Subunit: 424 residues, 4 copies
């Protein structure tokens, strides 16, 4: 009934989530097509594209420069001539107007770009002059001092005829190519990178599963109306309590309400500004479905045989707040020691993210023999610091390792006392 409604809401948020696992699969296979297209293009225009070489994909010869310039230039010259597929290159003007390349060959560089590092002086009217080449589907050079960045802005239509294997009509995908030579470092190292964007459109010559998803939304609507009715009844009870853990009698209906607001935003309403907000609304659904797990298990305990382990959770968190506080404060001191020591010989201590990453090395066995062995092997320097890196890292491994069993077990021997009260 009403708990059958709660079990139906667990099952129906679970079924909206099954349709979400379905749609997340559907978008995932679409993204398989996307990533296949991505790697395909990365090889494809990639004059010299090696696996992992995109990390190194920076030029050193100036002739190393202009050659790859020619290389893609021929790529665009003869793409229809060479392709294992069919690319659609119509006018495609960008990114400033006027008019169409479709490949816009653009290049930024400072206007008074005056500089003499042998003279210890420079005259930056660094107003970046962008020089652009439009190139119609059927050679020049720039100052190695002078440039800022170089841009190849092309675009290529394609038909998703593999969708014929998904039983779909093939869609229209315009792959929009931004090729970027980036010499903003100007340090003699200039990475090259290629950006592409796919304008998925339907076929020009041109939904029962869609009816099912909209039903999952409207049933989410009914279930949220149920969750709001239950919040009003618990609100009637709390007004009796003010005028007179399980912890989720109301808030779960709310947080379910929040995940539901996020997913319904994903289907239609924010579903026309697509990508990231859908990713977010599905994120909010992730919290709702975790709770669908946790709270459904609450109800289907059916008291869980008195719920001794469910009773296990309570008084510890009363202490656990300050304890996790204390564990953080030592850890923040240790993160400070990492931010101090990380710069001289490390990449693992490279930022606050990396000081977080070494915290994964702390509790997890994966970071230990790697980091504390390799850094003891001394990339290193300044042999007092070779002593210091070992004396820091071996020191950092120990205190938490000994103390952490004692904390989960100080609360764990605390759990034998709330089980000393509670084993009876």
């Amino acid at each position: 009934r009403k708990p059958c409604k709660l079990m139906l809401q667990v099952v129906k948020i679970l079924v909206v989530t099954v349709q979400l696992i379905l749609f997340g699969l559907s978008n995932q296979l679409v993204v398989t097509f996307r990533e296949e297209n991505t790697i395909a293009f990365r090889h494809l225009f990639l004059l010299g594209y090696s696996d992992g070489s995109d990390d190194t994909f920076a030029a050193y010869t100036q002739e190393q420069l202009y050659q790859a310039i020619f290389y893609a230039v021929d790529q665009y010259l003869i793409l229809p001539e060479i392709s294992l597929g069919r690319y659609a290159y119509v006018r495609g003007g960008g990114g400033p107007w006027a008019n169409g390349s479709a490949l816009a060959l653009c290049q930024r560089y400072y206007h008074r770009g005056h500089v003499d590092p042998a003279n210890d002086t420079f005259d930056i009217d660094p107003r970046v002059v962008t020089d652009c080449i439009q190139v119609d589907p059927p050679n020049l050079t720039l100052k190695f001092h002078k440039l800022i960045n170089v841009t190849i802005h092309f675009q290529l239509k394609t038909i998703n005829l593999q969708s014929l294997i998904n039983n779909e009509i093939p869609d229209c995908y315009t792959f929009s190519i931004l090729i970027t030579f980036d010499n903003k470092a100007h340090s003699g190292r200039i990475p090259i990178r290629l950006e592409t964007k796919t304008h998925i459109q339907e076929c020009k010559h041109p939904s029962f599963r869609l009816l099912f998803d909209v039903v999952v939304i409207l049933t989410c609507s009914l279930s949220f109306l149920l969750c709001a009715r239950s919040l009003l009844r618990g609100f009637l009870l709390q007004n009796e309590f003010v005028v007179f853990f399980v912890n989720g009698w109301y808030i779960l209906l709310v947080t379910s309400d929040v995940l539901t607001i996020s997913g319904t935003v994903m289907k239609i309403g924010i579903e026309a500004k697509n990508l990231a907000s859908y990713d977010v609304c599905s994120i909010l659904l992730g919290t709702s479905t975790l709770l669908v797990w946790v709270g459904v298990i609450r109800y289907l305990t059916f008291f869980h045989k008195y719920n001794i382990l469910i009773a296990t959770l309570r008084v510890a968190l009363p202490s656990v707040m300050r304890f996790c506080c204390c564990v953080a404060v030592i850890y923040l001191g240790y993160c400070f020691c990492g931010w101090i020591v990380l710069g001289p010989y490390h990449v693992k201590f490279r930022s606050l993210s990396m000081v977080s990453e070494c915290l994964f090395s702390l509790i997890n066995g994966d970071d230990m023999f790697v980091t504390f062995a390799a850094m003891q092997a001394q990339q290193g320097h300044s042999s007092l610091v070779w002593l210091f890196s070992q004396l820091y890292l071996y020191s950092f491994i120990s205190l938490f390792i000994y103390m952490v069993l004692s904390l989960f077990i100080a609360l764990i021997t605390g759990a034998y006392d709330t089980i000393k009260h509670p084993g009876g």
Copy 2:
């Protein structure tokens, strides 16, 4: 006697399992020959076969296509001319009839294969036309739009004369070559793959260990008759119990009975439909031999000095069912958060298998510094989601890490209470 029969059955299932470790070694060395042949062929026909390049083994040039076409084509032209071994290529017609290549050079592609992705339209009479070339042991081209897949169906006899070093007569192995160009993606990426199958036959000019294995089977027969007699005696006892842990007094005789049915199926009866069912029957033997371990240790406890630790197991599972239930329900919520969050930046969260794989990262130290460090390093996107991936992953690492010591120790401090009852 009868426990000497149970110890003899532990030893005799252990000896059927020693003969299984023997035969699993024997098949394992045969598979070493198979895998050696596999890598040998993979290099061998492999025009361009690199280690791990089979992962990348997809073409981009159409000329990149037809060249490898020629490459193997010469491979087949002059295999006897080039080989470090001796391959036997007799008529070998397949895979449809008519008649013999031995290399059948086949190629699928849709009949009304009409398509214009610049026109947003297509006319699939996609009825795949398979065009096949037979090629007698002693050039043409296809539409890059038009094809579906391309097949090289060859076959090569060989003699297992290294079996002379195993003291055996060399057997006759016909390696049956299926070379596959797969452009079913049609995304400009077409992986190539080569399949080979070995028809192991005896020498044309043409078993005490075999007598030993059949004895192990018939003695398995006697031991199962013993296990069935013991089930009937325990059944006489249970009929006295109905009419009036150790847990395996009967079921182990049964599950031993099941592993025994599976292995005897492996030797003779299902041993003429070979491969996978033998793998399965040996799987069932694996469960039988684990139990041979566990229950032999039961009997050879001889009460284990009162069996305090054997008494340790019981009442916890009465709670442990619902507890492992609860651990799963949080974990299923966490798997749902993974299925939500995994698609945008990850391969580790790529499927339900990968959400299971990150669960290995949860309890095991190997997944932690890799995943939570590398994903915090942000393949990433959409910096609220760069906050979100860390805020999810660091959140997911903690709750189970703290709680799990408390669970095995909530039942562990429970074990000090069934040892508080039980230490006396």
Copy 3:
């Protein structure tokens, strides 16, 4: 007030440390420029520089030798001709005087360098003759027996115009190139290595954040005067105690005093002998800021609700000293077994550092499946020792693994007793 001064000192050492995280970021990005320059140069002069090939960067052909000699020689010939940047090569004489290369092409080798390893004899007047070639910005050979080491000592100015993107004037960086051919092994293997040093100077044509850092120093001065006043008050109390944990009432003011002495040494006083001592003074700050964490959490416990977990620490360390002693003594025996067993088949057991590194394999899951699986796979030798490496490593994994839970839990069940005294 005074605890507001202690909280202000926690916040102000925390703010000197926030300015330290700021400066450590600032030096870190400068080091990003440095490392970018480093990898840039390593590719740059690197005739044959491959990623990780610096590990293998040793020659075998003598012609393999002199060619790379020519290769860099042309590198220096035509660096201005080839560069994607602007290098400043003025006279730059070194490393002995007279006068200027700027590339000094030097080569050591023993004077009576007489040797015949077919004759079992040699006449070392091994007085290394250093032959040097100065080479003006706009071929010869040496005995393969005769040389000791070979040196290319060059230097290159450059302007840090990317500092224009940091809003700074570009600084003047003189990159000082030491190219080293090292045949001191004389074992036919001669690694090549290139050293470079950057003399960062300001622009020739030529500080509110600096005012802020000096304020952080002077406020560190006031806070240390506070810490010294508090030590004098606690000293007045201890003189009352002699004449009549929390543990850090005085020593933390001291160790804060030490980190503060180290950082103020970093800003100005030792800040003219820069690199390593600043690294050290920041190290001492790392200890101060960890304590800022730990002791601020002490005060902001505000008794922590009676500080039961803070009371948790005490009596155990009274035992924990001897216990960590005992854990070390077994571990030192195990390190001795490693120093014995490591040499025959291992690199992980390669030194006392590596015997420390296998200790990371002990408690951390990362070293186990790698080392005990790969060494059981037997690089190996002398099959009794193939038994011995497994029998040692599997033995070493177990005793600590079983005992360590019992130690943290012997003290942990000790913590249920100081919580048996202390849960009341």
Copy 4:
């Protein structure tokens, strides 16, 4: 006195072990020279030697064969012409007599080597005919059916003049080259391998640290006489006990006696049959020095403040024998499931060594996310078995993971009871 003798024996076995760490360093640096020579040679003769390519170092072309044959052949032709060192190639006949190559170019192959794998028959008079070519320091071919293995047996003197940098006279090292083409598989895959052996001799034109080591031996002699006197006194006490843990009152003197017998065997007596027996005697020393750690800590407990933790060890092992028994018996069942399941899709389950290696994956976090993630990714086969590998591996991860905390903590909550008896 006598405990000063025991502390002196701890220190003197520790000093014999310090001289052992010294000699193990000395042999380790000698082995650095050896391994440097090893990698040097591996590149050196290595026509095509790539890092890790020794794993793949097998030929496929027959011309791929004979070319490398020529390649080393020229290696030997012009080694003095090409070398960055000085190799001494005198007559050096082997491995059968007659007379000298120094490169013996040998090749085995069966005498009646008759075989037709197209005919399903063969006539093995497989009596391997070895054909040998001697080649004086200043072309032919064999049947691809016919050969067994091919051998290049050379030898090269060299002088260890880098020992001049160790202050030593350079020794005489004869590097004895065995080059092996191995086609014993005859599977078209023939790995090539090169063996070299170094005859270290002194210089032809030709020990205070040695006096120190012999003193360490004779003092080991005095300390063993002390250990034997202490065994006789404890034997007088045990004869009083028969006629009327600490556990090592006698046996440690013995096991110290055993390690001492092994090391004294290393210095002189077995020190003329060198390599492996010295490795062994040092192994026995490893056990002695571990005990030097453990028992010295016993005495220097000085009762360890009543030795509560030393008292901690005792009664558990009375149970721990059968418990480690039970842990093994489940684990042997699990190893049996691994030996069953490992062959179809795995290399980690490849032998009993690998079933041991997955046991490292069990307790250590390193094997988990790798194996259970990658095998769930399905190298795989036969989708019921794709279910089976996950259903086995995920099953195997759990039971020990839950139970093992309960075992070390069943004995650990047992330790709170021998600390319940023992905390008083």
